[PDB]
Amino acid sequence: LRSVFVSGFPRDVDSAQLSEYFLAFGPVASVVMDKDKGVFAIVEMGDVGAREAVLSQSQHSLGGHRLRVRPRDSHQLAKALAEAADVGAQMIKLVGLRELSEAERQLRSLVVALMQEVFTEFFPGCVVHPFGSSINSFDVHGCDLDLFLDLKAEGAAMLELVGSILRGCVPGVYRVQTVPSARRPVVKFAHRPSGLHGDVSLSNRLALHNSRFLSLASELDGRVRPLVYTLRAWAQGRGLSGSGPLLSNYALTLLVIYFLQTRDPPVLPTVSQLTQKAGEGEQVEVDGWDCSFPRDASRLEPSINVEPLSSLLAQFFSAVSSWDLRGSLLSLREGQALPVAGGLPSNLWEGLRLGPLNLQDPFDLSHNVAANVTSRVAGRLQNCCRAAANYARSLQYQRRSSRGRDWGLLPLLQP
Ligand SMILES: [Mg+2]
Ligand SMILES: [Mg+2]
């Protein structure tokens, strides 16, 4: 597909002139005007890279006329987002569509209850804590159900025992696979009646609190869920968020939250500030790290930041693209970037893994959630952010479309 659809050039303009214009971007193979009609025309470039170079620039003009050059479940999403009022309404609608329905959530709680009632007989006093995607209120349709069982060879034996229990005892669950061989040992399971799948971890415990923190963030400000959902969909769109060297959903969420912490008025407070507001009985530590923070966001002061969702999204793209990733450790606790060269963040907090992208976990401070991210992924993240930022400054992002044209979020959510 080296050919591009080009329309909008003035009446009585030569195809040789279009050829001459597109000649700047590279070799032009052919230019064919619409024969019986007029208006648009098709331009085939010599190189596919030249075609990508033409599509790369959103600003085209000839003879004083601006040119439109375009290459030439999900459909429900696009249609619904096209029906919205503006960018903000689009983001909120995206949240409403992707988020779990109440039936799904209560179904999840029911399944958790089943698992608990089965496990309690084998391990008296054991507690099954749902964590991650389900309880952090960033949940999406068909997301994993991750359970933590609260009670390295003995760990493997115990893991196999849990696998056996899931296999032969609790009714309805199939696809049981024990995985001791991973950084965090886990037992994969699938419950058939509820149509759910997930992982059971022996000790993930710290992560549980992380989830809670995330939830609190969503309760602290109303823009958090739209921003995080939208940026999740976007990162998954550009191939940024993911499994391998790609960013994890948790790391991305942490990045968005950090961005919200770094705004001129803060949208979210720093984790340290939350720890200060914890209070008696809410004090909790895990592996030496302080995990404490308020139960409800009601007794916490609101955000004086008046920035709308659109401006916050554009500011996210711009700021993330503008940051220095390799030389900075992004801190959620202090809500700011701590310089790597000088300040030696690796001295205190021993075991901290630095690199292309450094993002510090709000509780365990020796943990870089972005440590897995390679140079290519980081650079491509900043590049995509620069792109999206330049797009957010256009009229296509800011305003709606009269009929049928993709506007606002829709170009950002496409592959
Ligand atoms: Mg019973
Ligand atoms: Mg999973």
Numbering used by the authors: 55 to 126, 145 to 223, 334 to 597
Give passages from the manuscript.
The crystal belongs to the space group P43212. In the form-IV TUT1_ΔC structure, the N-terminal domain adopts a typical RRM fold, with four anti-parallel β-sheets stacked onto two α-helices. A comparison of the structures of the N-terminal RRM of TUT1 and the U2AF65 RRM1 suggested that the conserved aromatic or hydrophobic resides (Phe59, Phe94 and Ile96) on the β-strands would be involved in single-stranded RNA binding. The N-terminal RRM is mobile relative to the catalytic core domains, and the C-terminal domain KA-1 domain rotates relative to the catalytic core domains.
After transcription, the 3′-end is oligo-uridylylated by a terminal uridylyltransferase, TUT1 (TUTase6)910, one of the members of the non-canonical nucleotidyltransferases. TUT1 is composed of N-terminal Zn-finger, RRM, palm, fingers and KA-1 domains. Thus, the present structural and biochemical studies have demonstrated that TUT1 acts as a U6 snRNA-specific terminal uridylyltransferase.
